[PDB]
Design a protein around this nucleic acid. Structure first.
Ligand SMILES: [Ca+2]
Ligand SMILES: [Ca+2]
Length: 314
DNA sequence: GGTAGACCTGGAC
DNA sequence: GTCCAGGTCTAC
């Protein structure tokens, strides 16, 4: 059928697959795990969302990642469009190689890795990543997903509509820094986060040099990027790390939240050594992050995703 | 120089 | 009706 969300069976000629074994990527373990909040399983095993300013539907078989895009005449995705999908999932980074290494240096990682293959990091857009995680503060994933959706619906550009779903592109800096946005976001249920959304948008455009400043961070060292990000209102060590890890190419960045503290204590009998406190605090979180980096290496941020993801399913 | 309390809310024991 | 989720900010 020419309407609604497509499926592999429904409209064969509209799909193109990317070679990708299930071992290298599990959509069901990556898309809804708190990295990106804009993907939905509209129909069993099919995930739809905005990717590179267009709407897509993804679904995988044992060895392939099937992709279909909605733009004027319907047709299978082009190589360039697909190249964008390969880049979004950073498929050049071999998960099997990382799993092997982590497992080799962490008997526990190896035990959990057995049942949670295919967990990797998406390479996201800095702006979408920054505001989505500014909303992550003291918040659960489902609720975060709700705010972000309402936000994009209210300030994002309309793309296309499938069934009763109107997909929007993520809002721009200009739109987010616009007048009365805070109040509007409060009516959308963002709470105090509404202020930070507004404040960081203006801070970027009016004090840091705009979009480029943010994008430039992809060429800056992890320490540099993390330092710079914390300048923005509503951005702490936690959010700063999520952004470094998920959108600024800093794979050693490790977000330290309650989940990771629980993992640290329950699975490694970890405890602060250079800190006064016995629990989460600026000093102890920095220490935990260093512990995980020292344990997993340059891609500690990725290893962190595998466990964080497994800890949600539980 | 580290820490307790304010800031918002839909859903859960 | 408290308790809780990928925290951050700032007054002692
Ligand atoms: Ca929390
Ligand atoms: Ca900050």
């Amino acid at each position: 059928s020419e309407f609604g969300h497509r499926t592999l069976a429904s409209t064969p000629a509209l799909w193109a697959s990317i070679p990708c074994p299930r071992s290298e990527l599990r959509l069901d373990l990556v898309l809804p795990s708190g990295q990106s909040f804009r993907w939905r399983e509209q129909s069993p095993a099919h995930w739809s969302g905005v990717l590179a300013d267009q709407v897509w539907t993804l679904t995988q078989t044992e060895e392939q990642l099937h992709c279909t895009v909605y733009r004027s005449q319907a047709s299978r995705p082009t190589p360039d469009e697909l190249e964008a999908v390969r880049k979004y999932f950073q498929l050049d980074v071999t998960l099997a190689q990382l799993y092997h290494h982590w497992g080799s240096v962490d008997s526990h990682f190896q035990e959990v890795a057995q049942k949670f293959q295919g967990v990797r990091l998406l390479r996201q857009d800095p702006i979408e990543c920054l505001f989505s995680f500014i909303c992550s503060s003291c918040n659960n994933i489902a609720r975060i997903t709700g705010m972000v959706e309402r936000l994009c619906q209210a300030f994002g550009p309309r793309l296309i509509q499938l069934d009763d779903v109107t997909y929007h592109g993520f809002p721009s800096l200009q739109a987010l820094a616009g007048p009365e946005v805070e109040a509007h976001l409060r009516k959308l249920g963002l709470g105090y986060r509404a202020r930070y959304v507004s404040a960081s948008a203006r801070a970027i455009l009016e004090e840091q040099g705009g979009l480029a400043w943010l994008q430039q961070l992809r060429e800056s060292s992890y320490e540099e990027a993390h330092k710079a990000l914390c300048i923005l209102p509503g951005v702490g060590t936690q959010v700063a790390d999520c952004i470094c890890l998920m959108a600024l190419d800093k794979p050693q960045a490790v977000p330290v939240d309650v989940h990771m503290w629980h993992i640290a204590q329950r699975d490694y009998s970890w405890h602060p050594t250079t800190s006064q406190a016995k629990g989460p605090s600026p000093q102890t979180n920095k220490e935990l992050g260093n512990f995980f980096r020292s344990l997993w290496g340059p891609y500690a941020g990725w290893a962190q995703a595998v466990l964080f993801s497994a800890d949600l399913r539980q």
